[PDB]
């Protein structure tokens, strides 16, 4: 049958596996990546943001972005054939159409990739925990690029696809949402950094507990992938960390699951909190502290200092970061300490 | 000999915790820094960090919660001067000026430096290869960067990272206002190091859990298929490589466990090394890329980029950090 | 001053890493296990258990 | 007649310690927001 | 400090309930 014939060809062992998931993955991924490359090289942001953002305009690799559509487009899908561009490729680019193009084709690409991990895992004979773990990247992408702007007034306040544009996003989130104070982001920090830690420490432990299986001073040759014995000593690595740190792994399966658990759990927590920031449901303040500080001008913590900084960010960057607001702050309203 | 018995116990492998000669410094210094930190977090009075007689409360008993609490850094009036207890006329003066900070950070840096050495030491006593301590050097260097190196270059322990959750964020924000560390490629490599480490940690754990060899039923944990010290490997590296090589392409996968584990060590350690170095070199005011007003039109109008939006935000942090401490128009301290 | 101060802190830090690297290896080469652990004479397997 | 689908449950000492740590640390993190 | 009048009970129960859950499970394991 033709379906079983197409299944035969999609699942062929090649250099680059295709699969059924490939019909979704490759065109969408290639179009997301091609759209970013296209815009950072040629496409402006002068009509959406008032910004330059292409190699063609003068920007470098740190300042090019496919920028978000202007606030006035709202949450328009901004389709090429839709009502705003009306099939004009030039105007679609000028209106921000590459942003949704990338975000949407990217979103579907990520679905294709996760389906790919499923598809290959079933063909090869392994459990599908790699695709499970990829949930955390998807949860992050969905919350930050789709949900968060859907919560806000427009796609404009989503992250623009660019290095320095992403940095601005980070800084917006400090000045406006006080994102560092949110315990869901704190749990993400602890899963990202704790993952880096587990990556570094488990790699070092294995490399420094190896058995001597060759006679060479470069110890890599002393492993054959078909071998049956462990290549390092779990007993010795256990005694070391028991005596250095107090506790040590004793179960290799629990250790590797834990390496999945930690950074996956943490990215999911940061998504949750971003979902909250979609609604401006911030961890911005502590009410007890504000009540004390309003009644006691000699009370000063690092929490109250950060808020002064957030207020400075907001007043100093908003007139050009939110240009649809036609903000005009006369100098005397700007918050600033002495001298500076 | 009695000294040889002492030395035999200091260096014993039969101690529940290894002591060792590095430990003869580590244990007292860490205990001192830990006890003083606990007491100052709960009980310290306000500290005049900016040396402008505007004290900053940081302890629990003075109206802080776990999030806002800090041991506050020592005064800007002190600068880089050494300031132990005995240099102060009274405990009251010492607390007002930030004494516990120096006591804690100097004991801690000494204690953690010896922690690193302790790692080499026990490894040598166990017959191990010795480089775990080289990996731990990446967070240690980072701690050195923000407690010691950055104060040296700026000229005051008052610009050290506060020992506190919010204090830390106050450090990151003021740092970005002053040095543009997001636009510095050494912090970017640190991001690439911790993000990548998180990714690879996630990857390695899912790939090995994926290749676990069936040894248990369904009514029990897969973990009980591994027994502490079996000689057989518990997963199938060939199947895991078969999987992941098809995910991308086969030559983008690791078939050598030692080569893969070396990569797991090297990627985060190197990246954290560079980000330690980024704090350590921004200490000497070699700052991140500055692209402000870099793009111009043919008439000469500025055409902003995202860098100029980053600057507007940097400016707003700049004119609000240490809002009373500046009497002159350039931020040179 | 910035250029000279920053470069030599980088060089200094990496040479301290260099010291830790070659020191520990020197110690392990001299003792005879810089290439890994002998399976037939694993030291920890002959020490008693911590508990 | 006894239900044949019953199974004993188990939590070993390590899991108890890891779990108590997860809860204590989460409390230590969230209590500030609870007290607000 | 003018804090939430329910933060104390909230924190106390947030700790106590899952802790007792785990303790219950552990001790009935050790008796088998």
């Amino acid at each position: 049958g033709w379906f079983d014939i197409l299944d035969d060809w999609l699942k062929r062992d090649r250099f680059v596996f295709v699969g059924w998931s490939g019909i979704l993955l490759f065109p969408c991924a290639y179009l997301a990546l091609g759209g970013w490359l296209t815009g950072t090289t040629f496409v402006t942001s002068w009509y959406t943001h008032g910004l330059a953002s292409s190699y063609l305009e003068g920007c470098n690799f740190l300042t090019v972005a496919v920028s978000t559509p202007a606030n006035s487009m709202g949450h328009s899908l901004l389709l090429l054939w839709g009502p705003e561009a009306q099939g004009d490729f030039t105007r679609w680019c000028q209106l921000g159409g590459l942003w949704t193009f990338i975000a949407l084709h990217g979103a579907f690409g990520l679905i294709g990739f996760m389906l790919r991990q499923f598809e290959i895992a079933r063909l090869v004979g392994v459990r599908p925990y790699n695709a499970i773990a990829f949930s955390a990247p998807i949860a992050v992408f969905v919350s930050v690029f789709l949900i968060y702007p859907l919560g806000q007034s427009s796609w404009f306040f989503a992250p623009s696809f660019g290095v320095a544009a992403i940095f601005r996003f980070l800084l917006f989130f400090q000045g406006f949402h006080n994102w560092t104070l949110n315990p869901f982001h704190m749990m993400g920090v602890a899963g990202v950094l704790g993952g880096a830690l587990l990556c570094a420490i488990h790699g070092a432990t294995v490399e420094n507990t190896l058995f001597q299986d060759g006679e060479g001073a470069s110890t890599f040759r002393a492993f054959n992938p078909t071998q049956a014995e462990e290549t390092y000593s779990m007993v010795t690595a256990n005694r070391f960390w028991s005596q250095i740190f107090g506790i040590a792994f004793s179960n290799k399966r629990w250790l590797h699951f834990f390496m999945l658990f930690v950074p996956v759990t943490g990215l999911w927590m940061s998504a949750i909190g971003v979902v909250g920031l979609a609604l401006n449901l911030r961890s911005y303040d502590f009410i007890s502290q504000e009540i004390r500080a309003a009644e006691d001008p000699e009370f000063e913590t690092f929490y109250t200092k950060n808020l002064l900084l957030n207020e400075g960010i907001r007043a100093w960057m908003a007139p050009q970061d939110q240009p649809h607001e036609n903000f005009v702050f006369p100098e005397e309203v700007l918050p600033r300490g002495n001298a500076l | 000999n009695l000294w040889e018995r002492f030395c035999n116990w200091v260096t014993s492998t039969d101690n529940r915790l290894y002591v060792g000669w590095f430990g003869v410094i580590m244990i007292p210094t860490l205990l001192a820094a830990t006890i003083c930190f606990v007491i100052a977090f709960i009980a310290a009075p306000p500290v005049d960090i900016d040396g402008i007689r505007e004290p900053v409360s940081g302890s629990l008993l003075y109206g802080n919660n776990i999030i806002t609490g800090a041991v506050v850094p020592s005064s800007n009036a002190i600068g880089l001067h050494f300031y132990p207890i005995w240099e102060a006329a009274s405990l009251d003066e010492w607390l007002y000026n930030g004494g516990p900070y120096q006591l804690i950070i100097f004991h801690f840096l000494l204690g953690a430096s010896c922690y690193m050495g302790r790692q080499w030491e026990l490894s040598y006593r166990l017959g191990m290869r010795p480089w775990i301590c080289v990996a731990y050097s990446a967070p240690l260097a980072s701690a050195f960067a923000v407690f010691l190196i950055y104060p040296i270059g700026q000229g005051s322990f008052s610009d050290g990272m506060p020992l506190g959750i919010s204090g830390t964020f106050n450090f990151m924000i003021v740092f970005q206002a002053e040095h543009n560390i997001l636009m510095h490629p050494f912090h970017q490599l640190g991001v690439a190091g911790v993000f990548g480490g998180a990714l690879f940690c996630a990857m390695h754990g899912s790939l090995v859990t994926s290749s676990l060899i069936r040894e248990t039923t369904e009514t029990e944990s897969a973990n009980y298929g591994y027994k502490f010290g079996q000689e057989e490997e518990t997963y199938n590296i060939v199947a895991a490589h078969g999987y992941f090589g098809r995910l991308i392409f086969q030559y983008a996968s690791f078939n050598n466990s030692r080569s893969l584990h070396f990569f797991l060590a090297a990627w985060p350690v190197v990246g954290v090394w560079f980000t330690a170095l980024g704090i350590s070199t921004m200490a000497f005011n070699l700052n991140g890329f500055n692209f402000n007003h870099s793009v111009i039109d043919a008439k000469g109008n500025v055409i902003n980029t995202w860098a100029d939006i980053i600057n507007r935000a940097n400016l707003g942090m700049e004119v609000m950090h240490e809002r009373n401490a500046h009497n002159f128009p350039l931020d040179l301290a | 001053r910035s250029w000279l101060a920053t470069s030599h802190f980088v060089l200094a830090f990496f040479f301290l890493v260099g010291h830790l690297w070659h020191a520990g290896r020197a110690r392990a080469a001299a003792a005879g296990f810089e290439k890994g652990i002998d399976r037939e004479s694993e030291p920890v397997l002959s020490m008693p258990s911590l508990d | 007649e006894p239900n044949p689908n019953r199974q004993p449950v188990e939590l070993n000492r390590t899991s108890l310690y890891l779990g108590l740590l997860l809860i204590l640390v989460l409390a230590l993190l969230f209590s500030s927001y609870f007290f607000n | 400090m003018e804090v939430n009048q329910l933060g104390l009970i909230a924190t106390a129960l947030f700790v106590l309930v899952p802790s007792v859950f785990l303790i219950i499970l552990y001790v009935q394991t050790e008796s088998q």
Binding site: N238 | I42, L60, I66 | - | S31 | -
Partner: peptide
């Protein structure tokens, strides 16, 4: 009273460290 709760939780964590190290389950 918030202080007492913060310090109580910290203290339970230290007590946990103590038991997890010295009264751990011995790996055999």
């Amino acid at each position: 009273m918030e202080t007492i709760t913060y310090v109580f939780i910290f203290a339970c964590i230290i007590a946990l460290f103590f038991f997890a190290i010295f009264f751990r389950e011995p790996p055999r």
